[PDB]
Write a protein that binds this ligand. Structure first.
Ligand SMILES: [Mn+2]
Ligand SMILES: [Mn+2]
Length: 417
């Protein structure tokens, strides 16, 4: 109650628009074209528009106008599909009076009026904040009208990368729901990737999430070497481990979890040695996620490379010809996380992490089927991923519920919950 979207009140959405208007010159207008229905897939709103309004309907356009240097003169425009009894019955729209009473649009009109509504705002402003390079139908519309125009998405990204305390909590909720789902999967046996896939999906939704945050990875055995494996339909065998990358989303905010565990419910000595190597690197990289350390995301990645090389050296598999650490650990340490899984990709990887940012820490080892490696290591892929909120002098593991220590994993797998 009092919320506009799950976890976020209408007051925070208003304060986000105020913060953006605090960076805009007089006589400016920000134009954001929402997404359309993709024929029909579950609707994904343009996240910059959703971040500033909470509006989750297709075929919509948002305009934030700053006529003077005063923050109280700002006008929040919303052009939406019209409140239509016949259209709503076949296709429930909030209408033009709901978008003002619920979503707090100072001014609104039907999306049909776009060609007669937008130019009057454009003509009375000097700076037009619109990304001429995205696509939506209103985007192709709005762009043709514009044939000073300034980009806006990256400026919004600098705000989105710093999560508010309310954003951190709803992401904590998504991570906790997703994490407890993994624990329930640990306690059960699965003979096929699709059964484990559909199980976690049901636990995400029934646990309280709206949808999957992303297309899940359920890769058993040698399938774990395929970094982008999504088929999730292979038989699972007793001797191998399964790599699962899956998480739920809540109110538009994404969690992101990777766990690897043996299908038999018990680690072999070989599986233990490889798993602890990845867990050692992940634990040490998570400990760096304090803003007082002034590390950038790239700093942590390069430290993850150094840490992984030492783990390979401890395992004696660090000097295989043609298989340096960048071929056994061939991806980045992580990424910002928020309304998008790979959130705010335009912010700098090289600037120090700040309080409120949420990044993943997901190192991995993927040993090829080469005779130059020990046979008990070949075709074994491991990734361990958690969502870390950056704090002043500490951090918050948003997905800490999902166990990952070997003793914790084997306790759940063999004794249940
Ligand atoms: Mn992931
Ligand atoms: Mn990730």
């Amino acid at each position: 109650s009092g919320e506009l979207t799950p976890g976020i009140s209408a007051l925070e959405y208003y304060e986000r628009r105020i913060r953006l208007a605090e960076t805009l010159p007089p006589k400016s207008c920000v134009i954001l074209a929402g997404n359309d229905i993709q024929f029909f897939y579950p609707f994904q709103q343009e996240n910059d528009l959703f971040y500033l309004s909470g509006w989750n309907e297709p075929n919509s356009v948002m305009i934030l106008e700053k006529p003077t240097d005063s923050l109280s003169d700002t006008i929040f425009h919303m052009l939406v599909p019209p409140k239509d009894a016949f259209a709503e019955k076949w296709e429930f729209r909030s209408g033009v009076y709901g978008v003002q009473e619920i979503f707090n649009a100072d001014e609104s009109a039907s999306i049909n009026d776009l060609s007669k509504y937008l130019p009057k705002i454009i003509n009375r402003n000097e700076f037009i904040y619109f990304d001429m390079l995205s696509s939506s139908s209103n985007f192709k519309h709005i762009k043709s009208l514009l044939d000073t125009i300034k980009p806006i998405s990256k400026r919004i990204a600098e705000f989105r990368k710093i999560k508010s305390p309310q954003e951190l909590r709803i992401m904590r909720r998504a991570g906790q729901i997703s994490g407890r789902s993994f624990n329930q999967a640990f306690a059960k046996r699965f003979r096929n990737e699709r059964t484990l896939d559909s199980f976690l999906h049901y636990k995400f939704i029934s646990g309280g999430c709206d949808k999957d945050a992303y297309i899940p990875v359920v890769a058993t055995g040698s399938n774990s070497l395929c970094i982008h494996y999504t088929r999730n339909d292979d038989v699972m065998f007793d001797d191998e481990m399964v790599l699962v990358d899956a998480a739920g989303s809540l109110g538009g905010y994404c969690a992101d979890i990777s766990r690897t565990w043996p299908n038999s419910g018990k680690f072999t000595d070989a599986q233990r040695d490889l798993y602890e190597a990845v867990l050692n690197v992940q634990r040490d990289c998570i400990k760096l996620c304090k803003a007082s350390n002034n590390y950038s995301l790239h700093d942590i990645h390069e430290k993850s490379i150094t840490l992984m090389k030492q783990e390979l050296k401890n395992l004696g598999i660090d000097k295989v010809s043609g298989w340096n650490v960048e071929k056994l650990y061939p991806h980045y340490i992580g990424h910002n996380l928020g309304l998008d899984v790979h959130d705010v990709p335009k912010v700098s990887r090289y600037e120090p992490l700040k309080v409120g940012q949420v990044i993943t820490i997901e190192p991995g080892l993927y040993i090829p089927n080469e005779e130059s490696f020990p046979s008990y290591f070949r075709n074994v892929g491991i990734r361990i991923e958690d969502d870390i909120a950056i704090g002043e002098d500490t951090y918050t593991n948003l997905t800490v519920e999902a166990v990952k220590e070997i003793d914790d994993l084997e306790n759940v797998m063999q004794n249940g919950l």
